[PDB]
């Protein structure tokens, strides 16, 4: 090591991503850090609703007898899939909305159950994030052409053992979707926050942004998207009002001169980056420490 620099200041951070100790004079793009308190905003269309609960129960215990071994693999395993019956065939969801719940019934201390993704294209716990399917079926026995999610038993600071698997089969489509849970008293049809960075799932489109009210009066559709595919706005079917969506942290530009940051171009009227003065320019705001008594 010859010398080091700490990526703590504005100028030092710009040197760390530029991977150089000297930054040539010019204009550099940058992005503010995203907040972490992101609320959840959900918009959905009211349709014929029936809710199915896919509940998986995992329970095991050590073989009771003359040997009180604890680190050994469990000997008795009892895995059930709620209303699953082997002779009836796989448990296929046949309603519009559903949720998946994992119930651990093991009482042994330091022992816990878990489920892995395996070769499936989705995780058992993440299906509740508005995932779309044309059909979905769950079974405790092998399903042809499906995928398997391994079930594991874990000991604290000790190696874990496989205790079975869950078999899932699916097809693409928009008839069945997975919702988190029917809480008694939450209007999941239209519950959004405004003027704050929030995570949204609006009409089956997920992203992070800011929602606001625009006077636009488009008559066609309920969802408006850009060429990139990103959602630019949506319409409330009960109101008639159209809301716009903006990214939380749009890029800015920093002016560097003689290894120092002298100004910044901004899209908002904030004295950002510690500058004490801000001026209004024809197509952006400009913030700097300048006194505007210069000519060169």
């Amino acid at each position, epitope marked *: 090591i010859a010398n080091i620099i700490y990526c703590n200041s504005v100028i030092n951070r710009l040197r760390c991503d530029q991977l150089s100790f000297d930054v040539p004079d010019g204009f550099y793009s940058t992005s503010p850090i995203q907040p972490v308190e992101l609320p959840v905003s959900i918009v959905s269309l009211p349709v014929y609703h029936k809710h199915t609960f896919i509940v998986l129960y995992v329970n095991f215990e050590h073989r*009771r007898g003359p040997g009180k071994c*604890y680190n050994c693999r469990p000997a008795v395993i009892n895995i059930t899939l709620a209303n699953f019956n082997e002779t009836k065939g796989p448990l296929c969801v046949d309603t519009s909305h559903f949720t998946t719940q994992f*119930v*651990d019934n*093991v*009482k042994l*201390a*330091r022992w*816990s159950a878990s489920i892995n993704t395996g070769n499936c294209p989705f995780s058992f716990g993440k299906v509740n994030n508005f995932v779309k399917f044309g059909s979905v079926c769950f079974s405790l026995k092998d399903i042809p052409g499906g995928c398997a999610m391994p079930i594991m038993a874990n000991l*604290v600071n000790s190696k874990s053992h496989n205790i079975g698997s869950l078999y899932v089969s699916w097809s693409d489509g928009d008839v069945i979707t997975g919702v988190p849970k029917p809480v008694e008293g939450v209007s999941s049809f239209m519950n959004v926050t405004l003027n704050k960075c929030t995570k949204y799932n609006i009409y089956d489109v997920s992203g992070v942004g800011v929602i606001r009210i625009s006077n636009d009066t488009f008559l066609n559709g309920i969802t408006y998207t850009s060429t990139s595919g990103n959602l630019l706005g949506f319409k409330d079917v009960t109101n008639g009002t159209i809301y716009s969506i903006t990214p939380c942290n749009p890029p800015d530009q920093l002016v560097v001169y003689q290894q120092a940051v002298v100004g910044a171009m901004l899209s908002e009227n904030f004295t950002s980056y510690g500058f004490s003065n801000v001026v209004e320019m024809p197509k952006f705001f400009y913030a700097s420490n300048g006194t505007y008594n210069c000519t060169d």
Partner: antibody
Amino acid sequence: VQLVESGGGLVQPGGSLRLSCAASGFTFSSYAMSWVRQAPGKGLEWVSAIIGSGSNTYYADSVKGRFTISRDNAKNTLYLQMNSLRAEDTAVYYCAKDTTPRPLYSSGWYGSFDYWGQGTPVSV
Amino acid sequence: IQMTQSPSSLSASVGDRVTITCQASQDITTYLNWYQQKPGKAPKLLIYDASNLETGVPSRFSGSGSGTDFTLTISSLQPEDIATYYCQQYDNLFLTFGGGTKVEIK
């Protein structure tokens, strides 16, 4: 793994009290919390418990209906709502930590507490 | 579920093979843990699952039993062993504590 509580004092019967407990030095969301109090000259009486995700809430028979248990995983804080005080709630309260780590997508058993706090008493 | 700790108090000398038992009134199988309670301090975990020694406790403690009667024995009494003891079951979410015992010095 440090636990510290606050909110003790003297409250008239039937009012309200906002107890609190703070946790640090471990992944807070993976462990179920519990609330327990020791009456003067009595043993330990379980008050309430909360799952790591906060989805399931349990209470004792005397605790049931009077108080609500809540937790905030964004700041590693455990909250309790003392409502409808009686004279028998005069005791010291401890917040405990379960020993079994569980995934946030799973509900599970509890009962083997290993680490406790320091104890904030209340009077009524 | 009711649990009884007996005797509520006993005195012993340094080196005695102290033993304490508590009943459960129900088939708890193996779901019990023991606690250490120094007055003026919060409790600490001694043995879980009725037979496992916690990594933070000296190896001079041992417990065993199955069904409804469970036992906790001390190999030999040391000067810091003087403290309140408690058994607690976790076979049900509405868990209960025992009557509590107060060991004493001789």
